[PDB]
Structure 1
């Protein structure tokens, strides 16, 4: 097995389709797009609407394997803090207010996790 490509995508959990980026990214190397879509969606079925980073390794005969990762740190901070699209209405709007352990791959790395939140700028309680 000799690697011909390593394709890095981020896709919506349970929601891959053969449309771009999946289609062109896998298609360039002849990988089975439909097989990827199906396995990806099966593997991320219990994940809600999370962003799932996914790495596809493609071989010279078009076979491939993939690894999924943990959602991006910025996504987790935002979701836990109530930040969502849609209902931006005139008048008052409220700012927002562990993930270190889910995102660590040793110890208190939550220093640029609490810090990223404030750069965001989400208020932390404790």
Structure 2
């Protein structure tokens, strides 16, 4: 509906996510597309400058994900 397999609660520097930890292992263990999240998070936050951004990623059984950020 979809079925949730994990929720991942991070804080990441705005615009500056990479596939490295915590992102790689936190998402990858559930098969979520690491690079897609990196690019999406960076698009969602690059224009925030030097901020630290709370982000929650929900990962589903089909390996898709959704996410929510908080400003800032």
State whether TM-score is above 0.5. yes
Structure exhibiting the larger radius of gyration computed from Cα positions: 1
Q: Which has the higher contact order (CA 8 A, sep 6+)?
A: 2
Q: Unaligned regions of 5+ residues in structure 2, if any? A: none
Provide the TM-score with structure 1 as the length reference. Answer: 0.55
Q: Unaligned regions of 5+ residues in structure 1, if any? A: 71-126
Q: Which runs of 4+ in 1 moved over 3 A?
A: none
By percentage of residues, which structure has more strand? 2
Q: Once superposed, what is the RMSD of the aligned Cα atoms?
A: 0.5
The superposition leaves residues 32-88 of structure 1 with CA deviations (integer Å, 9 ceiling, x where unpaired) of 000000000001011001000000000001000000012xxxxxxxxxxxxxxxxxx
The superposition leaves residues 1-44 of structure 1 with CA deviations (integer Å, 9 ceiling, x where unpaired) of 11110100000000000000000000010000000000000010
Provide the TM-score with structure 2 as the length reference. Answer: 0.95
**Number of residue-to-residue matches in the alignment:** 70
